Amino acid sequence: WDKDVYPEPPSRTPAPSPQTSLPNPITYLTKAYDLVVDWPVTLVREFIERQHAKNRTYYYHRQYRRVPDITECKEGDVLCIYEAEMQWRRDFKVDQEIMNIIQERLKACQQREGENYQQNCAKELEQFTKVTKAYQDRYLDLGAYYSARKCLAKQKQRMLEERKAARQE
Amino acid sequence: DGPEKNYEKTLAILQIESEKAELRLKEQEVRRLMRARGDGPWYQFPTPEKEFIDHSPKATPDN
Numbered sequence: 643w644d645k646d647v648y649p650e651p652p653s654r655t656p657a658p659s660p661q662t663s664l665p666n667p668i669t670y671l672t673k674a675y676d677l678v679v680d681w682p683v684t685l686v687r688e689f690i691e692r693q694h695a696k697n698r699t700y701y702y703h704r705q706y707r708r709v710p711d712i713t714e715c716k717e718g719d720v721l722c723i724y725e726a727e728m729q730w731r732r733d734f735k736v737d738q739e740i741m742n743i744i745q746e747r748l749k750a751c752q753q754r755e756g757e758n759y760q761q762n763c764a765k766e767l768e769q770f771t772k773v774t775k776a777y778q779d780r781y782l783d784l785g786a787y788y789s790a791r792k793c794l795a796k797q798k799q800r801m802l803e804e805r806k807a808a809r810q811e
Numbered sequence: 812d813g814p815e816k817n818y819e820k821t822l823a824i825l826q827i828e829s830e831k832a833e834l835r836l837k838e839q840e841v842r843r844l845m846r847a848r849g850d851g852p853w854y855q856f857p858t859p860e861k862e863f864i865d866h867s868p869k870a871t872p873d874n
Binding site: 718720721724725728 | 818821822825826828829
């Protein structure tokens, strides 16, 4: 729908270019299908659309504002920890949906490129592998009881490994 | 009603139970100190009564 989140290259089709002096049953069946099925269906949907527009109603998104993270939180203060764990779990669900979006992009690219996919579907491939490695360095080796504190301990161990690495000249 | 109710009611319950934990552990250490040393109102074990002593003049001086 939003073609910046869900990009779709334009469906360039070749002109028919026929050689036979003979008919194609596809096209005339398409005409019949249109003037039989698509016309009453479009009538019904236009009716339903104008009846929506008679009494239109709106809904919103609930922007959630940021909160003191758990690193700014004291050992034992259960209220701050609760709020921080909640915003973490929120971001976690959002990250899963991001990963789903990128997997969807990858699959759709694979299908449209079809056979010649392993040369011109590498962009979405790398955009999948990078975010995958992020998720792996962010949420992977936890368990069912994941939490902000566990992700933080993981990040801290990894930063320690990186410090010990860059210690080497 | 909405999410604010649940969120903030949870926060109330959390402060309640955290305070209760604090006070339970405090009560434990308090009882420990009061029993190890009788500085406090509790665990003050009884002593002999003072008012039933006779202070009057006796039959001998070196009572």
